[PDB]
Amino acid sequence: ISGAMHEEDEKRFLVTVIKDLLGLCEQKRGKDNKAIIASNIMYIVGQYPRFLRAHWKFLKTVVNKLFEFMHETHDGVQDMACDTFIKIAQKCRRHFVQVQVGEVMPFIDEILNNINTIICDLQPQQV
């Protein structure tokens, strides 16, 4: 239903949806559970660029978090991490090239200086 609500309702609603998925994620034990929960939060965020676009500090945190999961060994997660990353890079492309508020350098730069550390563990297709 992304885009069927007013941006302002969208915000309040998404803050509630993911604050508690995050909370659930920490709650449930077993990587099997955490992997499912984690993938879902990622799917959700991926579907709400407009949200991401208006909140850089959250966007950046999601992307850095996506980079972390690219080293996750649990089956499927790496595919999730990359798939979400491409949605986000398309839909939020400008926010990576222009200096955002509270930062001194375009985020793309930090990415380019670490390509290797980030893709380390990824399979060819994911790369």
Binding site: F58, F69, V77
Partner: peptide
């Protein structure tokens, strides 16, 4: 609207998401 900031505090929360990393606990 001015909109100073708030989403900044919502970021520190996501910092708590375990799944693998190490986990050296067992029965």
């Amino acid at each position: 609207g001015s909109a100073s900031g708030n989403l900044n505090e919502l970021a520190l929360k996501l910092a708590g998401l375990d799944i693998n990393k190490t986990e050296g606990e067992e029965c």
